Design an enzyme around this catalytic site. Structure first.
Site, PDB file in Angstrom:
ATOM      1  N   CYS A   9       0.837  -1.194   0.000  1.00 53.47           N
ATOM      2  CA  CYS A   9       0.000   0.000   0.000  1.00 53.47           C
ATOM      3  C   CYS A   9       0.879   1.254   0.000  1.00 53.47           C
ATOM      4  O   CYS A   9       1.844   1.340   0.756  1.00 53.47           O
ATOM      5  CB  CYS A   9      -0.934   0.026   1.217  1.00 53.47           C
ATOM      6  SG  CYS A   9      -1.657  -1.573   1.666  1.00 53.47           S
ATOM      7  N   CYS A  12      -0.364   3.647   2.914  1.00 54.77           N
ATOM      8  CA  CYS A  12      -0.216   2.925   4.173  1.00 54.77           C
ATOM      9  C   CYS A  12       1.216   2.416   4.343  1.00 54.77           C
ATOM     10  O   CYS A  12       1.770   2.451   5.443  1.00 54.77           O
ATOM     11  CB  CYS A  12      -1.216   1.761   4.248  1.00 54.77           C
ATOM     12  SG  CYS A  12      -2.622   1.893   3.107  1.00 54.77           S
ATOM     13  N   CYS A  22      -7.136  -7.287   6.105  1.00 58.07           N
ATOM     14  CA  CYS A  22      -7.580  -6.295   5.133  1.00 58.07           C
ATOM     15  C   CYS A  22      -8.378  -6.951   4.004  1.00 58.07           C
ATOM     16  O   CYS A  22      -7.816  -7.634   3.146  1.00 58.07           O
ATOM     17  CB  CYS A  22      -6.370  -5.519   4.572  1.00 58.07           C
ATOM     18  SG  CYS A  22      -6.435  -5.146   2.798  1.00 58.07           S
ATOM     19  N   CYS A  27      -8.561  -0.287   1.949  1.00 59.06           N
ATOM     20  CA  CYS A  27      -7.713  -0.681   3.074  1.00 59.06           C
ATOM     21  C   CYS A  27      -7.804   0.330   4.208  1.00 59.06           C
ATOM     22  O   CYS A  27      -7.407   1.485   4.061  1.00 59.06           O
ATOM     23  CB  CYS A  27      -6.259  -0.791   2.610  1.00 59.06           C
ATOM     24  SG  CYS A  27      -5.288  -2.062   3.443  1.00 59.06           S
ATOM     25  N   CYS A  37      -5.885   3.858  -2.179  1.00 60.14           N
ATOM     26  CA  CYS A  37      -6.090   4.292  -3.560  1.00 60.14           C
ATOM     27  C   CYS A  37      -7.111   3.404  -4.256  1.00 60.14           C
ATOM     28  O   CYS A  37      -6.849   2.238  -4.536  1.00 60.14           O
ATOM     29  CB  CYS A  37      -4.773   4.280  -4.339  1.00 60.14           C
ATOM     30  SG  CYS A  37      -3.345   4.866  -3.395  1.00 60.14           S
ATOM     31  N   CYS A  54     -12.391  -8.045 -13.885  1.00 60.36           N
ATOM     32  CA  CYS A  54     -12.796  -7.110 -14.932  1.00 60.36           C
ATOM     33  C   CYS A  54     -11.675  -6.125 -15.251  1.00 60.36           C
ATOM     34  O   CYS A  54     -11.150  -6.107 -16.364  1.00 60.36           O
ATOM     35  CB  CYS A  54     -14.054  -6.345 -14.510  1.00 60.36           C
ATOM     36  SG  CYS A  54     -15.366  -6.340 -15.755  1.00 60.36           S
TER      37      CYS A  54
HETATM   38 ZN   LIG Z   1      -3.571  -0.383   2.842  1.00 61.18          ZN
END
Ligand SMILES: [Zn+2]
Length: 60
Positions: A9, A12, A22, A27, A37, A54
């Site tokens: 992340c 993060c 998570c 998150c 994001c 997808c």
């Molecule tokens: Zn995260």
């Protein structure tokens, strides 16, 4: 043209191998508790061209 990659992340900065604690969404665990994001956040799966889910961006 799918630009994505596998990493930890960004907002993060907590690398995670196995999905633990998570859920696949915004998150918000510990360091991630603040911001994330998008829902996907540049995953590799989307690189398959909607092969698995997808893409790296879902509508609202
Ligand atoms: Zn995260």
């Amino acid at each position: 043209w799918i630009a994505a990659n596998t990493k930890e992340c960004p907002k993060c900065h907590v690398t995670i191998e196995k999905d633990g604690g998570c859920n696949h969404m915004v998150c918000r665990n510990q360091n991630c508790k603040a911001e994330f994001c998008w829902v996907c956040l540049g995953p590799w799966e989307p690189h398959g061209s909607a092969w698995y889910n997808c893409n790296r961006y879902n509508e609202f």
